[PDB]
RNA sequence: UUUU
């Protein structure tokens, strides 16, 4: 088998795509982990509005899926 | 009578589960824990508007999403009889 | 844990998201590693290899033997 | 979590899950993401709506902290 | 709990989704999970007469319980619930 | 324990509990626990014609998590002693 | 340490913003780590939906459960 | 994984 958090740990320094339970997503470079992302794009998947962030602390409570 | 005592006593029996999201699940209770997590066998899943229905051989339900469970009267009767004899 | 390895499962999340994928790993908090994931939109989109956070799961079921049925309840 | 040192004492953008934004100097942060800010401006639908001289924000509402 | 004061008596539960269910309190625990037996739901509305749905044995998860009222048998005997109209109880908003 | 203790000092006095479903219930506080679950006696729903559902309920259990406010007469609250108790609770938690 | 901000407001008037488009102005007499609070001489403003109206109420003494609190500030 |  495979361990989710070991896979995520493998993703440090690589690009990660995060899908919230709500209709919001973030895509950025995983810095560490609640997660810290660098050079992030935030997507509102209903309104379509996109916003950029240099670096951010993302609260973990609302994340649904993490995708390498 | 404790609620989890009743829930454990309905293992092996039919059960109706309604979730916060409004779906209902009809099936046989295969197992449960003190979180109220459930595993059901031979299940009918009903979507919130009663529009659509699925058959599932088995399924796992996180207890934190349960609103309520419906349990046969005989289960409650069985538990009360056993506890009132355990008193003696 | 009262609960598929390499079998295709369906999962439902609080908030409504619904996905299928092949269970390739898990841990005791019920985080999942699913491969070949497809999200059913509210039609599909393909997510590939995903880590799902167990705290957001509401439902896990196997896909094999799961089917839509007409109303089975006596009116 | 070298994010903290990089961010404590500088201007930050706080987005709540509700979508309301707060911009201000971050005094302090904790594990539940409770925040203390130093001169907060509140933005709703992107518009400045209120100015607070100091603010404690309860962390359960915080979606993210992003550096500016 | 104070709910021990209501044991083995008719009780009326208001849930977070606004539903009203009456039944005999057979047990509870420290999270407010409840067992009701001989229970039924009451749907009071403004547009139509009250509906009563039989529910049997009902295990309610405490997270979904807002209030548990002790139904006063005399007061309830004085009321004709058939001709009673009222607003839907709102959902709990956290 | 600070607010559990505070509510204990209000037992036997009249309070109004506003819930997160926008219902408000007035009654005599009879009991409170560590969760701030509360038991009220001789309740009357504030807007009773809006909510006739509790016309047969005199004693009421309210789950602490569904409370928005409790408001009470200032006559039964010593705010100098309350603030001192708060400072001693904060210090104990240091 | 964030809570130290609220420590400085003990016995001072605070503004509190709550979930559900509610706001409080009152004198902070006690709080705990959940942000449960007791305010004295409090005014509540409820905004009803651009707003349709606001409703102001006064409370001599008011316990507020902490899980409704969004933010706490000087008035 | 039920009341912060």
Author numbering:
A (entry chain E): 4 to 36, 41 to 75
B (entry chain D): 1 to 88
C (entry chain G): 24 to 26, 31 to 69, 79 to 111
D (entry chain F): 6 to 73
E (entry chain H), F (entry chain B): 1 to 94
G (entry chain C): 9 to 57, 66 to 91
The authors write:
Eukaryotes possess eight highly conserved Lsm (like Sm) proteins that assemble into circular, heteroheptameric complexes, bind RNA, and direct a diverse range of biological processes. Among the many essential functions of Lsm proteins, the cytoplasmic Lsm1–7 complex initiates mRNA decay, while the nuclear Lsm2–8 complex acts as a chaperone for U6 spliceosomal RNA. These proteins share a conserved “Sm fold” consisting of an amino-terminal alpha helix followed by five antiparallel beta strands that form small beta barrels that assemble into ring-shaped hexamers or heptamers.
In the Lsm2–8 complex bound to the UUUUU-3′-OH RNA, the 5′ uridine is bound by Lsm4, and the next three uridines are bound sequentially by Lsm8, Lsm2, and Lsm3. Uridine binding involves stacking and an extensive hydrogen bonding network as previously described. We confirmed that the RNA remains completely intact after prolonged incubation with Lsm2–8, further supporting the idea that the last uridine is covalently attached but disordered in the structure. Consistent with this, Lsm2–8 still binds to oligoU RNA ending in 3′-OH, with a Kd of 100 nM. For example, Lsm2–8 binds to telomerase RNA (TER1), which has a stretch of 3–6 uridines ending with a 3′-OH.
